[PDB]
Every structure is written in structure tokens, then in C-alpha cells.
Design an enzyme around this catalytic site. Structure first.
Site, short mmCIF file in Angstrom:
data_model
loop_
_atom_site.label_atom_id
_atom_site.label_comp_id
_atom_site.label_asym_id
_atom_site.label_seq_id
_atom_site.Cartn_x
_atom_site.Cartn_y
_atom_site.Cartn_z
N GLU A 35 72.53 35.61 -3.84
CA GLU A 35 71.57 35.82 -2.77
C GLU A 35 70.25 35.11 -3.06
O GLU A 35 69.65 34.52 -2.16
CB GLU A 35 71.30 37.30 -2.57
CG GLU A 35 72.43 38.11 -1.94
CD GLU A 35 72.67 37.75 -0.48
OE1 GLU A 35 73.75 38.13 0.04
OE2 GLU A 35 71.83 37.04 0.12
N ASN A 46 66.08 34.03 9.05
CA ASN A 46 67.37 34.09 9.73
C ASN A 46 67.25 33.61 11.17
O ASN A 46 66.16 33.51 11.73
CB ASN A 46 67.95 35.50 9.72
CG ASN A 46 68.11 36.06 8.34
OD1 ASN A 46 67.62 37.15 8.06
ND2 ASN A 46 68.76 35.31 7.45
N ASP A 48 68.02 35.11 13.65
CA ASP A 48 67.64 36.13 14.61
C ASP A 48 66.14 36.45 14.52
O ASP A 48 65.68 37.32 15.25
CB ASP A 48 68.48 37.41 14.45
CG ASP A 48 68.19 38.14 13.23
OD1 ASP A 48 67.39 37.63 12.42
OD2 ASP A 48 68.73 39.26 13.16
N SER A 50 64.45 37.58 11.97
CA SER A 50 64.22 38.37 10.79
C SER A 50 64.13 37.46 9.57
O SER A 50 64.43 36.27 9.62
CB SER A 50 65.35 39.38 10.62
OG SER A 50 66.56 38.67 10.41
N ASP A 52 64.93 37.57 5.18
CA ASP A 52 65.50 38.24 4.02
C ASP A 52 64.53 38.12 2.85
O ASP A 52 63.94 37.07 2.64
CB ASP A 52 66.84 37.63 3.59
CG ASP A 52 67.92 37.78 4.63
OD1 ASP A 52 67.88 38.72 5.44
OD2 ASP A 52 68.87 36.98 4.58
N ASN A 59 67.01 42.49 4.53
CA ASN A 59 66.64 41.91 5.82
C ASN A 59 65.65 42.78 6.58
O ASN A 59 65.78 44.00 6.62
CB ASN A 59 67.90 41.71 6.65
CG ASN A 59 67.60 41.02 7.93
OD1 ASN A 59 67.42 41.68 8.94
ND2 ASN A 59 67.51 39.71 7.91
N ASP A 101 75.33 53.08 3.58
CA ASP A 101 75.30 53.26 5.02
C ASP A 101 76.66 53.10 5.69
O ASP A 101 76.73 53.14 6.92
CB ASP A 101 74.29 52.30 5.68
CG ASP A 101 74.72 50.84 5.62
OD1 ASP A 101 75.85 50.53 5.19
OD2 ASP A 101 73.90 49.98 6.03
#
Length: 129
Positions: A35, A46, A48, A50, A52, A59, A101
Site C-alpha cells: 500500500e 482516488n 472518487d 477521496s 488514501d 481512505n 466491518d
């Protein structure tokens, strides 16, 4: 801070990640390698909107607030900049929420694509843990 492999493994073990939700330490070290290349200051934007953040590329759509991801959540209740610290506590505590989650470490695309199903124990071999 750019961690060494064994330095990060020891830090993660101290913070309770070894076998956390059944994921052995090597999984977490492997995920961090791919990562962020073990760099706590890693950021990546990203498609979208967002971003990271940090050693585990957590994120801002869901997990932290960076003030520029409209309509996002802050499920770890932290500013995203806290995830860039040389102290990995905030990243680890947030990662524990993410991995709990429902989707396990499949939340980390690099883990799914480059660690899952591989000999992840190799990432901690030779370390004095």
C-alpha cells in the site's frame, strides 16, 4: 517515517495486530509494503475524490476527515493527517475498525491482489519478534 520490514512488524505486534480477527502479522506487513512501501507519509488521490492516507492507505471516503471529501464519513473519528504520523497508533486503531466491518482485509485492494493466498509469513521471517 519509512519503516524497515522487521521494525514495522515489531511495532504492529506491539499494537495488537498479530492474529487480529485471525490475520497473522505477515498479512499486515505485506499490506503495508504494497500500500505505502512502508512510508507513513504516503498519500494517494482516488478517482472518487477521496484520498488514501498513511502506511495502510486508509481512505477518506469512510474512515477519516480531510475536509475535502464531500459527503464522506469519518468512522475512525480522526483527521486523516493523524494517519501520516511516525507513530502508527492511529493507523492501527483505525485499521482494526476497518478489518472488523465484515470484509476482513479485502478492504485493502493491494492485500487482495498481492498478499492474499501467498506465503505472507515470509514478510516477518528473520525478525526478532
Amino acid at each position: 517515517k519509512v519503516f524497515g520490514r522487521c521494525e514495522l512488524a515489531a511495532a504492529m505486534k506491539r499494537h495488537g495486530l498479530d492474529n487480529y480477527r485471525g490475520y497473522s502479522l505477515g498479512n499486515w506487513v505485506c499490506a503495508a509494503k504494497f500500500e505505502s512501501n512502508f512510508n507513513t507519509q504516503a498519500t494517494n488521490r482516488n478517482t472518487d475524490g477521496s484520498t488514501d492516507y498513511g502506511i495502510l492507505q486508509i481512505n477518506s471516503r469512510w474512515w477519516c476527515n480531510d475536509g475535502r471529501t464531500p459527503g464522506s464519513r469519518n468512522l475512525c473519528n480522526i483527521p486523516c493527517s493523524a494517519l501520516l504520523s511516525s507513530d502508527i497508533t492511529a493507523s492501527v486503531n483505525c485499521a482494526k475498525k476497518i478489518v472488523s466491518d465484515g470484509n476482513g482485509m479485502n478492504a485493502w485492494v493491494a492485500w487482495r491482489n498481492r498478499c492474499k493466498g501467498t506465503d505472507v509469513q515470509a514478510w516477518i521471517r528473520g525478525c526478532r519478534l
